[PDB]
Design a protein around this ligand. Structure first.
Ligand code: FAD
Length: 458
């Protein structure tokens, strides 16, 4: 229960576990949505706390899986959290950063701090569901989750997997009047109930031996492309609206032009709300066509990616591809591939295709491949791999290791679109790739200045 007139739509919250309410603080286990503003999970947690006459507290688990990615993501995330600590303290909301995996750490925190209720935010990824299961086994209090990431709650937008954007889109657009709304201000707590610097230090030390390097031993990653944190995210949204949105409709498929929003690292870590971004873009007057194109990406393609992972347990595997695509890829499984590259050759940009290699260099060096070349890139991994299953493994591996926005439903769904035709149609049949949409080198040369892209990332 929340207080009357809390302005919380109950369809954004789902019970994970019934239990017996304790009498201590409401705990928001923050995971996907690392921000203090425009955060329905935090707002709901604050409202339940108010109704129960207790403070709200935030807990965040620094998990054992950080060593599966790189310094690039750890630093981006932790520097954000350092800023988040301050923002929350200004609301008199304490934040606790627990070192370990959530099953053990959240269970013990709930016991030690006498939590009344546990709330988390929503992710459809397997790792979050693994963590939920272990937490559920270790707690006796009620446990809710709130969809703070999507404008329309994932379980409301559709009751099933949607095979196409054109079947998801009408369902989603029909629910915006309900769910696309301004956010209330977060009410501070009535009174105030190892540093992150130390953690960051220790973690970087553990990641240093796996850092991506040039043959010169100097690191590949350039950390000045995306300043982390909630405040920077807002400035990137504002600069997009002011300077790039007008040209987005025309230039979003031109990787030589910096005309995308550059919001994905912030959106992935939840340092900015996609609902906020949509409210601000909807209010803007910009060139015809651009707003439509952008909203189709951040509403339909982003939220269909959560739809994909939520309703397909096997979202990272061949089995989740549509039937037409499985049958087509199977029919061509024994076709001789034109090339076969090792994961190390792909990783180092050592194929015979200079556009592919430049796309990989953009990823290595900036942590954000242009969205047009991500499609080209993944499709060539299919073409130059022993099987579609190996192609998925390679693409996921590289995406998750080197993208700042990786380890994300958008990535699994984008790789499945690219390799498996998920949310696509069948195209003309070719050897190796069957009826999966093909993106040729020469087609790219007709579309944009390939030589300039290669020079930029060489
Ligand atoms: C093989 C492949 C891998 C991808 N990997 C990721 C990934 O790891 N993480 C990730 O967040 N996105 C991924 N994408 C989707 C897309 O490429 C990026 O979201 C986009 O490039 C992000 O840059 P931006 O924020 O400047 O994009 P913008 O074009 O300005 O769009 C803004 C937001 O809309 C969303 N969006 C845009 N395009 C897509 C899309 N095709 N699918 C889903 N959402 C979209 C994103 O949240 C994006 O940040 C991938 C796509 C493909 C084909």
């Amino acid at each position: 229960l929340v207080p009357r007139g809390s302005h919380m739509n109950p369809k954004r919250i789902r019970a994970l576990k019934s239990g017996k309410q304790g009498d201590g603080p409401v705990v928001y286990w923050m995971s996907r949505d690392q921000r203090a503003e425009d955060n329905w999970a935090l707002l709901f947690s604050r409202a339940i706390a108010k109704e129960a006459n207790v403070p709200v507290v935030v807990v965040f688990c620094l998990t054992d899986e950080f060593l599966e990615a790189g310094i690039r993501q750890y630093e981006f995330m932790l520097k954000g959290l350092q800023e988040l600590e301050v923002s929350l303290s200004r609301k008199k909301i304490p934040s606790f950063f627990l070192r370990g995996d959530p099953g053990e750490k959240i269970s013990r925190f709930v016991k030690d701090y006498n939590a009344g209720t546990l709330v988390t935010d929503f992710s459809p990824l397997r790792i979050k569901n693994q963590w939920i299961e272990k937490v559920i086994s270790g707690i006796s209090i009620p446990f809710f989750e709130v969809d703070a990431h999507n404008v329309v709650p994932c379980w409301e937008a559709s009751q099933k997997h949607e095979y196409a954007a054109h079947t998801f889109r009408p369902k989603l657009y029909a629910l915006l009047p309900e769910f696309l709304e301004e956010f209330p201000e977060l009410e501070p707590n009535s009174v105030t109930p190892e540093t992150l610097s130390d953690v960051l230090e220790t973690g970087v030390k553990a990641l240093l031996p796996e850092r991506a390097l040039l043959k010169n031993k100097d690191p590949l990653f350039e950390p000045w492309h995306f300043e982390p944190g909630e405040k920077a995210a807002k400035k990137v949204m504002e600069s997009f609206i002011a300077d790039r949105l007008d040209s987005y409709g025309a230039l979003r498929n031109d990787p030589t032009k910096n005309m995308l929003s550059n919001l994905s690292p912030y959106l992935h870590f939840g340092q900015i709300s996609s609902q906020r971004v949509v409210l601000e873009v909807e209010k803007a007057e910009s060139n015809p066509g651009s707003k439509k194109a952008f909203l189709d990406e951040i509403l339909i393609w982003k939220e269909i990616s959560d739809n994909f992972c939520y309703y397909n347990p096997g979202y990272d595997g061949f089995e989740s591809f549509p039937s037409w695509a499985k049958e087509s890829l199977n029919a061509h499984r024994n076709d001789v591939r034109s090339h076969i590259y090792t994961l190390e050759e792909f990783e180092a940009g050592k194929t015979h295709d200079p556009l592919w290699n430049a796309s990989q260099m953009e990823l290595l060096s900036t942590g954000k491949m242009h969205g047009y070349t991500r499609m080209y890139w993944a499709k060539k991994i299919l073409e130059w791999s022993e099987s579609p299953e190996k192609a998925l493994e390679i693409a996921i591996c590289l995406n998750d290791r080197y993208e700042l926005d990786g380890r994300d439903p958008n990535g699994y769904a984008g790789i499945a679109w690219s390799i498996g035709g998920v949310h696509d149609r069948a195209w003309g049949e070719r050897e190796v790739t069957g009826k999966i949409r093909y993106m040729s080198y020469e087609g790219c040369k007709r579309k944009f200045d390939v030589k300039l892209y290669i020079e930029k990332y060489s």
